[PDB]
Design a protein around this ligand. Sequence first.
Ligand code: OFG
Length: 287
Amino acid sequence: NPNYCFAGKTSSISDLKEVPRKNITLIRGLGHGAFGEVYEGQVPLQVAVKTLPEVCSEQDELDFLMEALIISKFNHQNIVRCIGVSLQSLPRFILLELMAGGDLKSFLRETRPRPSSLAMLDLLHVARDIACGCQYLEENHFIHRDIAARNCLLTCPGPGRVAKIGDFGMARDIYRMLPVKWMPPEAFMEGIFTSKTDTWSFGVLLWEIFSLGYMPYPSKSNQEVLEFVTSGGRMDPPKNCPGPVYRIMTQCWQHQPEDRPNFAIILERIEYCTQDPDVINTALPIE
Ligand SMILES: Cc1n[nH]cc1-c1cnc(N)c(O[C@H](C)c2cc(F)ccc2-n2nccn2)c1
């Protein structure tokens, strides 16, 4: 059985909480993300059920086990909880906290203001939530490598929503298709990853958030983005984006890793934005 170390402590599949398969009922599909299908389920505790296809390479199965160990070891309010696993029956399950708000990218898309609602403060709270998750990862020396709106989840649609990081598939692969639009130069050029990798990606997530769910670098392909960013190019501000928010982005995208803020600083600047009336009184565009 494969080992895993986080915050020092070592763990193995033996440490995962096995839930009796009989206690698990599937309700409906939620979609699949390359790894396999995910269902809403119950154990009554509401869960999202990540499944391993019974037809898979042993490498797929190892990846699956590792993902289980990674998420079970985190303990933070802005990282999705693992209720447990069911590995002793096929297909194998990983059981996650059900985030009723769905993923962040689709939420932003479906909830953007129209003549038929969202405010700057809602976007800032999401940004703060994920920054807090990233800060917890940073201080535990875990590099996520794929911070992006599609990998974040919301507890609910309404104002009290809490955003959390919900997928760790990229980190799992590296621990043992590239998200180039979320990657800093040293990452996609040299394959160098550090805490400052996630800072760059967070800047891109911020853009995704305040653009309300647009794809980064609109109209550019991966290679054009690679060349654009390598030559010092950066995204323009999203529509109606307050200058203080855009400036967090541009600081996250500093070419030198050492010139980019750590997450404690990012959280400070996000806080300041939420206090600033000229920021939060700015109306979002209505499509
Ligand atoms: C309800 C609901 N509607 N739409 C999504 C959910 C949902 C709630 N809670 C979860 N724990 C959850 O987890 C999966 C693994 C996930 C995690 C992530 F970060 C990004 C995407 C996905 N995803 N979306 C569909 C298939 N895979 C999904």
